[PDB]
Amino acid sequence: THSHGLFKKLGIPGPTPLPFLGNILSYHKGFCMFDMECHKKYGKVWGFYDGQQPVLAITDPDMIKTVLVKECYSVFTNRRPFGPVGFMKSAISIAEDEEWKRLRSLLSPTFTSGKLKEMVPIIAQYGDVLVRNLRREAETGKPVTLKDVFGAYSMDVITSTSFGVNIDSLNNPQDPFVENTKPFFLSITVFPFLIPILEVLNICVFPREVTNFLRKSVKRMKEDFLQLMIDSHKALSDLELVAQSIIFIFAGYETTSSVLSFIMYELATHPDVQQKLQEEIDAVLPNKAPPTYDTVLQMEYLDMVVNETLRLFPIAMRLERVCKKDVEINGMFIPKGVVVMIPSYALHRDPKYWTEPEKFLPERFSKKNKDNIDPYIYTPFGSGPRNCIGMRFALMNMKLALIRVLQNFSFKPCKETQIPLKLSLGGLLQPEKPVVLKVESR
Amino acid sequence: THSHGLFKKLGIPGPTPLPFLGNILSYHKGFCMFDMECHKKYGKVWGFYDGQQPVLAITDPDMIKTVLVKECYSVFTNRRPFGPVGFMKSAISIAEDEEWKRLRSLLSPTFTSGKLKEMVPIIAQYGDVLVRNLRREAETGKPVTLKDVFGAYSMDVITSTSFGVNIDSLNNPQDPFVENTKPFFLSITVFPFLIPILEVLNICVFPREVTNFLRKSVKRMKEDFLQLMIDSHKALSDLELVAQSIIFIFAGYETTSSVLSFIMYELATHPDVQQKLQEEIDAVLPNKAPPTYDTVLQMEYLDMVVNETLRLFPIAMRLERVCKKDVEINGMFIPKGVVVMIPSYALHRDPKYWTEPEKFLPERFSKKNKDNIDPYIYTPFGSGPRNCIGMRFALMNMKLALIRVLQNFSFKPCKETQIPLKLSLGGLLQPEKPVVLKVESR
Numbered sequence: 001t002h003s004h005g006l007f008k009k010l011g012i013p014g015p016t017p018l019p020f021l022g023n024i025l026s027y028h029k030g031f032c033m034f035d036m037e038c039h040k041k042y043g044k045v046w047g048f049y050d051g052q053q054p055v056l057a058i059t060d061p062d063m064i065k066t067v068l069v070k071e072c073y074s075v076f077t078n079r080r081p082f083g084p085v086g087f088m089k090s091a092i093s094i095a096e097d098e099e100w101k102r103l104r105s106l107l108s109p110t111f112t113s114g115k116l117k118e119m120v121p122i123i124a125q126y127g128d129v130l131v132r133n134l135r136r137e138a139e140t141g142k143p144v145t146l147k148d149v150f151g152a153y154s155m156d157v158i159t160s161t162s163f164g165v166n167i168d169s170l171n172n173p174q175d176p177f178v179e180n181t182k183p184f185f186l187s188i189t190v191f192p193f194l195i196p197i198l199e200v201l202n203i204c205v206f207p208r209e210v211t212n213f214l215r216k217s218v219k220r221m222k223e224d225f226l227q228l229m230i231d232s233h234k235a236l237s238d239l240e241l242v243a244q245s246i247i248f249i250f251a252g253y254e255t256t257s258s259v260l261s262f263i264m265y266e267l268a269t270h271p272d273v274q275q276k277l278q279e280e281i282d283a284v285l286p287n288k289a290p291p292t293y294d295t296v297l298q299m300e301y302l303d304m305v306v307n308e309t310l311r312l313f314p315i316a317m318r319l320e321r322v323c324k325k326d327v328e329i330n331g332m333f334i335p336k337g338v339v340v341m342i343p344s345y346a347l348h349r350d351p352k353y354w355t356e357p358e359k360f361l362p363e364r365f366s367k368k369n370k371d372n373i374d375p376y377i378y379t380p381f382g383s384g385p386r387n388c389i390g391m392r393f394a395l396m397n398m399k400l401a402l403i404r405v406l407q408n409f410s411f412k413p414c415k416e417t418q419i420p421l422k423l424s425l426g427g428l429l430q431p432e433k434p435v436v437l438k439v440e441s442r
Numbered sequence: 443t444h445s446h447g448l449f450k451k452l453g454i455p456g457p458t459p460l461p462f463l464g465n466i467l468s469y470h471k472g473f474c475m476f477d478m479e480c481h482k483k484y485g486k487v488w489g490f491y492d493g494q495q496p497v498l499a500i501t502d503p504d505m506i507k508t509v510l511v512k513e514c515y516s517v518f519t520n521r522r523p524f525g526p527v528g529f530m531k532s533a534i535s536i537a538e539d540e541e542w543k544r545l546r547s548l549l550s551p552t553f554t555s556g557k558l559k560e561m562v563p564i565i566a567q568y569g570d571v572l573v574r575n576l577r578r579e580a581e582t583g584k585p586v587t588l589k590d591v592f593g594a595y596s597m598d599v600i601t602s603t604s605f606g607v608n609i610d611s612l613n614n615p616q617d618p619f620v621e622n623t624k625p626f627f628l629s630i631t632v633f634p635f636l637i638p639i640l641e642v643l644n645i646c647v648f649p650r651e652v653t654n655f656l657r658k659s660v661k662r663m664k665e666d667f668l669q670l671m672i673d674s675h676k677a678l679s680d681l682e683l684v685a686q687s688i689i690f691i692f693a694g695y696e697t698t699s700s701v702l703s704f705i706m707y708e709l710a711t712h713p714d715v716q717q718k719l720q721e722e723i724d725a726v727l728p729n730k731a732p733p734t735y736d737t738v739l740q741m742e743y744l745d746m747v748v749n750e751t752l753r754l755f756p757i758a759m760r761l762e763r764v765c766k767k768d769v770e771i772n773g774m775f776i777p778k779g780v781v782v783m784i785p786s787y788a789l790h791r792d793p794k795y796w797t798e799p800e801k802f803l804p805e806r807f808s809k810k811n812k813d814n815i816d817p818y819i820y821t822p823f824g825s826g827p828r829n830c831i832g833m834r835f836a837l838m839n840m841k842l843a844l845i846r847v848l849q850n851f852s853f854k855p856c857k858e859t860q861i862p863l864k865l866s867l868g869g870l871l872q873p874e875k876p877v878v879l880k881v882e883s884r
């Protein structure tokens with residue numbers, strides 16, 4: 001408990017922690033409800049304990065910019081430790097300090113405007129596979145699971161954008177890594193001292209059978225992101241090369257299909273926005289013209305729909321940085337070892353910044369009203385040197401999928417559609433019941 | 443084993459490590475013999491594994507200066523992690539990086555030339571208690587255990603030099619902390635991942651009964667080193683104050699009596715040096731004059747005796763620094779996490795630097811021959827910003843004890859004297875059998 005007197009000493013308010021457990025019993029309603037409740041109880045700053053780990057939550061936009069941007073390289077360089085990872089310690093999202101800096105610098109030129117412009121005529125293929133597979137499940141009066149057909153699409157994109165492997169994600173044969181994307185973490189906070197125990201037993205969060213399903217696949221491409229790695233600080237090792245491919249597969253698959261599912265739920269439960277977005281798509285792309293890089297960046301209402309959905313459902317929920325040494329940001333002492341946390345979900349739904357924050361209103365992001373939005377309150381991709389490096393790629397992939405789908409189909413709520421949607425009362429930001437909707441062909 | 447291929451990759455030679463154990467089975471002859479053997483087998487540089495921890499030994503004087511002095515603050519700032527320590531993490535010899543820098547800067551003015559000059563007329567008291575207690579055990583024909591009566595003296599000095607507590611160390615009553623100075627570490631190298639487990643069970647290397655024998659004693663002196671702490675970077679906390687007192691007690695007690703025991707063994711087994719040193723003491727201090735600060739610094743042969751003994755018996759044996767990031771010192775790549783080690787015992791007995799290194803010859807340190815001695819080969823107190831901060835104090839205390847003792851007594855080997863002396867085939871640099879000698883009154 002000796003560390004549970006930290007916030008009491010610093011005069012920082014917060015819920016009283018129980019011995020050993022801290023405040024983790026409050027996660028029984030999920031991180032999000034616990035964050036919004038503390039935001040209401042304690043105000044701009046509060047602390048709690050993930051077991052013995054003190055966590056200081058900050059909501060001041062200036063203080064948030066200081067942590068994420070101004071003092072990132074010096075004090076707030078790394079995220080909360082995560083284990084056991086095995087060789088995934090060399091992953092960019094996990095790597096720390098100097099190893100992270102080397103990985104970030106040599107992986108940043110992967111998501112430039114030029115590299116993304118090269119991937120657009122390639123992603124267009126699986127948009128048609130997405131429509132034709134949707135055409136089958138839609139031509140029959142059978143409600144459709146979005147994250148299934150969206151997940152099949154998201155799989156198709158990430159294998160080719162970074163490597164070159166092309167598969168219709170209903171081939172169902174030799175190289176689906178569904179084994180890769182296939183509660184013990186509750187003990188990570190109670191037993192973070194057991195991370196060193198498990199890191200010597202080869203225990204990873206995914207088994208060694210999967211992380212060799214692709215480890216060999218990388219070597220056969222001695223014969224895109226895979227290319228750019230062997231093309232390029234000390235050069236990329238062959239195993240580091242492997243670890244970043246894994247990070248991109250998780251990111252490009254789980255985030256894409258999940259956000260697209262939240263988007264289509266919003267359009268179905270708001271028929272006006274769906275019709276308005278369908279009008280804009282028909283105007284920029286008449287005769288169902290194929291979307292391109294520049295035409296995707298021309299659709300303003302499409303971007304307003306995407307941003308507003310990301311406000312309601314920020315899949316990260318929280319942004320975190322480890323305070324690597326004593327600091328005093330914006331007039332507040334922060335001792336070493338404290339985990340600094342930014343409650344993105346809570347700030348995205350704060351009534352003090354958003355009128356009717358529970359309502360889905362894309363007009364918040366109109367160029368008339370977008371200016372009234374603080375970039376350090378709305379942070380769906382983070383901020384600063386450790387923001388989402390695949391942000392521009394993620395937006396481009398999702399919009400290309402929406403354009404081609406809304407060009408051919410309309411979406412209505414079915415009898416089994418969960419309205420209003422329940423968020424997963426568990427850890428990662430997902431819905432409780434999967435999203436199902438009726439699909440009609442235009 | 444995955445880390446056991448490190449030195450094989452780097453082309454660095456060394457003994458082949460067994461799985462899990464590494465090369466720790468070779469410590470069965472002690473660190474010293476293993477170091478000297480590797481020095482002979484592999485030359486200037488070699489590596490081995492304390493379990494899964496790679497340890498690179500360097501013997502090049504330039505490379506040693508680079509580690510200890512030139513690149514100390516930047517790369518080689520901390521020692522090998524030590525556990526479990528409890529609150530002793532705040533101890534200066536244990537503390538790391540910025541916390542160490544703050545502790546070093548605010549504790550350095552304790553061992554100045556001026557502060558040491560103030561402690562000399564106080565240490566002179568227990569030199570007489572040392573003689574009178576020696577006078578009893580010497581007036582009777584009963585061989586004497588040095589580390590007993592030296593340990594009683596060393597205890598007397600450290601309590602007063604830093605606090606003000608005066609005790610005849612044969613009072614045997616209320617405040618002897620023999621409980622403080624009262625094989626499980628073999629598992630520290632095989633289970634360094636268990637250090638985080640034990641650090642939450644309040645398990646220290648000394649029990650909580652002892653580390654509260656003095657924790658309360660510090661507070662009663664709200665009512666010397668204890669004074670200088672409350673007098674003084676953020677100021678010294680009250681518990682940090684406590685932790686450095688503990689470090690000084692261990693250092694000032696165990697090192698002092700052990701070195702003095704090795705010294706008196708050398709003088710007894712070399713009657714010429716003992717007579718020559720007794721002559722010099724009688725010349726600087728005629729009529730058995732009391733030794734002072736300046737008169738102690740005038741005796742050259744006394745310093746030659748002390749330095750040569752420290753060459754044969756460097757109680758640290760090894761100097762270590764943790765490589766905190768990839769470096770290339772003197773043209774050799776050193777990857778992050780590697781523990782850099784300097785085998786002081788091996789270098790002090792290297793025939794390539796010392797003619798007849800096993801022989802006790804104080805004339806190596808005559809001002810005629812001292813110049814031929816490399817300060818990065820002979821490092822009894824370390825070097826650089828993390829050298830022994832109590833070096834000047836340790837030399838002064840031991841010399842004041844030797845002067846007063848050699849002024850009144852001569853020392854002859856007894857029937858039970860271990861000749862030649864056997865070093866403890868175990869961990870810390872001690873003799874196997876305790877040192878006993880005959881004592882005659884002058």
Ligand code: HEM
Nearest residue numbers: 093248251252255316380381382383386387388389390394
């Ligand atoms: C809707 C889609 C996505 C969202 C909302 C999202 C959001 C985020 C957020 C909030 C962070 C943490 C930022 C911070 O801590 O300041 C992050 C990190 C990251 N994201 Fe994304 N992400 C998405 C998709 C992707 C994709 C497709 C990739 C493909 C490579 C990707 C790669 C990464 C990486 C590598 C990091 C860690 C960067 C670093 O630590 O240097 N993300 N993302």
Ligand code: HEM
Nearest residue numbers: 535690693694697758822823824825828829830831832836
């Ligand atoms: C014959 C007596 C002594 C010898 C040979 C000795 C030797 C050493 C050595 C070799 C080191 C490590 C240096 C390095 O790693 O570069 C050290 C560190 C240290 N010694 Fe001594 N020591 C002696 C007595 C003392 C005494 C009496 C004190 C009293 C305070 C003391 C306090 C310290 C401290 C605090 C450190 C750690 C310094 C730091 O890490 O900043 N030592 N000693």
Ligand SMILES: CC(C)(C)OC(=O)N[C@H](CS[C@H](Cc1ccccc1)C(=O)NCCc1ccncc1)Cc1ccccc1
Nearest residue numbers: 079080081082085088091093205247250251255316320388
């Ligand atoms: C400390 C705390 C738990 C609070 O948070 C995290 O560490 N949780 C994730 C967990 S690892 C995951 C992939 C993985 C999994 C096992 C081993 C190696 C690698 C990843 O790499 N990304 C997750 C999705 C995602 C990516 C990119 N963009 C957006 C979303 C890591 C993470 C990293 C950045 C932001 C949020 C979460």
Ligand SMILES: CC(C)(C)OC(=O)N[C@H](CS[C@H](Cc1ccccc1)C(=O)NCCc1ccncc1)Cc1ccccc1
Nearest residue numbers: 521522523524527530533535647689692693697758762830
């Ligand atoms: C990593 C490795 C084991 C190879 O080495 C070390 O850590 N072993 C010692 C161990 S802790 C000891 C006191 C203590 C003990 C338990 C908890 C807290 C504190 C200390 O503080 N000093 C030991 C004597 C001494 C001091 C001062 N001067 C000369 C000799 C630490 C140490 C530090 C510097 C140099 C050598 C050894």
